[PDB]
Design an enzyme around this catalytic site. Structure first.
Site, short mmCIF file in Angstrom:
data_model
loop_
_atom_site.label_atom_id
_atom_site.label_comp_id
_atom_site.label_asym_id
_atom_site.label_seq_id
_atom_site.Cartn_x
_atom_site.Cartn_y
_atom_site.Cartn_z
N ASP A 125 1.95 -13.83 -2.16
CA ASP A 125 2.36 -12.82 -3.14
C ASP A 125 3.55 -11.96 -2.62
OD1 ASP A 125 2.20 -11.59 -5.73
OD2 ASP A 125 0.46 -10.32 -5.20
N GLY B 243 -2.14 -6.10 -10.24
CA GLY B 243 -3.08 -6.80 -11.12
C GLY B 243 -4.52 -6.67 -10.68
N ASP C 297 -0.64 -6.20 0.77
CA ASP C 297 -1.41 -7.04 -0.15
C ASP C 297 -1.67 -8.44 0.34
OD1 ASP C 297 -3.06 -7.33 -2.40
OD2 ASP C 297 -1.57 -6.38 -3.74
N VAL D 65 -5.49 -0.27 -8.52
CA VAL D 65 -4.65 0.94 -8.57
C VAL D 65 -4.70 1.60 -7.19
CG1 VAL D 65 -4.23 3.21 -9.75
CG2 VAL D 65 -5.07 1.24 -11.08
#
Ligand SMILES: CC(C)Nc1cc(-n2ncc3cc(C#N)cnc32)ncc1C(=O)NC[C@@H](F)C(C)(C)O
Length: 286
Positions: free
Chosen positions: A144, A33, A162, A36
């Protein structure tokens, strides 16, 4: 601590952010989200370049957050940051490339990779747990945890990635973030707790057993969490859901992993095991 890059160097390394897939000779590896991910080569080193894409002040905050966490946290089950680029409007993060991509992609056999064996799926879970455990011992909450964020090296070593949403230290927030399909009920409310990471990992363990993504719009039931309700309400068994793409999955170890997942998936935050218990249970499993 980390090498500062100029945005143009990264344009060069990634063949000017080629959006064609790596399987076809392009540079695109995948997308979340907040950006890339592209393949590149910096001084013979294969790298993963995450180009941040959207609010701008929040993106900068998530960018600064990933750098701060990575600076403190270095472990064999965590992804490695080499550097970054903050030249103008574009924000980039440079990592050591993962030859086996994400667990999500390997579970779906994306780009024709062979299905993962049960033995491998077990070792991967064990790795993931050691990673979550290192972050927790270092007073960090990932926020996450999902299979797209559990990456795999050349040896299939699990590497948590992440950290843009990661938090230090039960608190609250006005901006609810994460992937709803993996999120603990309190996290969906706005609560920030390390116990939420345990719930998310339980969704991952269900993905590992079944080979099914946490959410699939074209599936009945759409949410993998609903499959646990069906099993709990004796309407089905875990055996009915074991990924058919494996041959070495023995029911004892399969049920043993389901047990850990269902403990992780407790409705009530305080009823869930802590990460060291999750590690202990997973080690006992083998
Ligand atoms: C974007 C994602 C899904 N895939 C990768 C991600 C990464 N890396 N490597 C480190 C890293 C860190 C972040 C973050 N945050 C995001 N992505 C990262 N390296 C590699 C891959 C990657 O696909 N390798 C290719 C591999 F799968 C193959 C050869 C079978 O096709």
């Amino acid at each position: 601590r980390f090498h500062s890059f100029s945005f143009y160097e990264l344009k060069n390394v990634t063949n000017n952010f080629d959006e064609r897939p790596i399987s076809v000779g392009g540079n695109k590896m995948g997308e979340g989200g907040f950006g890339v991910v592209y393949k590149g080569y910096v001084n013979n080193t294969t790298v993963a370049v995450k180009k941040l894409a959207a609010t701008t002040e929040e993106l900068k905050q998530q960018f600064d957050q990933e750098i701060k966490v990575m600076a403190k946290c270095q472990h064999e089950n965590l992804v490695e940051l080499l550097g970054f680029s903050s030249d103008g409007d574009d924000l980039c993060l440079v990592y050591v490339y993962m030859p086996n991509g994400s667990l999500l992609d390997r579970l779906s056999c994306l780009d024709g990779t062979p299905p993962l064996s049960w033995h491998m799926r077990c070792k991967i879970a064990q790795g993931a747990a050691n990673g979550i455990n290192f972050l927790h011992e270092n007073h960090h909450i990932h926020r996450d945890i999902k299979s797209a964020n559990i990456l795999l090296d050349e040896a299939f070593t699990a590497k948590i990635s992440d950290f843009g949403l990661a938090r230090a230290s039960t608190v609250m927030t006005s901006r609810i973030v994460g992937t709803t399909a993996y999120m603990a009920p309190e996290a969906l409310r706005g609560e920030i707790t390390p116990k939420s990471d345990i719930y998310s990992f339980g969704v991952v363990l269900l993905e590992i057993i079944t080979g099914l993504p946490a959410v699939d719009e074209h599936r009945e039931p759409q949410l993998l969490l609903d499959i646990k309700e069906e099993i709990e309400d004796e309407e089905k068994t875990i055996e009915d859901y074991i990924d058919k793409k494996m041959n070495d999955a023995d029911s004892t170890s399969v049920e043993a992993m389901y047990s850990v997942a269902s403990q992780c998936l407790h409705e009530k935050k305080n009823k869930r095991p802590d990460i060291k218990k999750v590690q202990q249970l997973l080690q006992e499993m083998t």
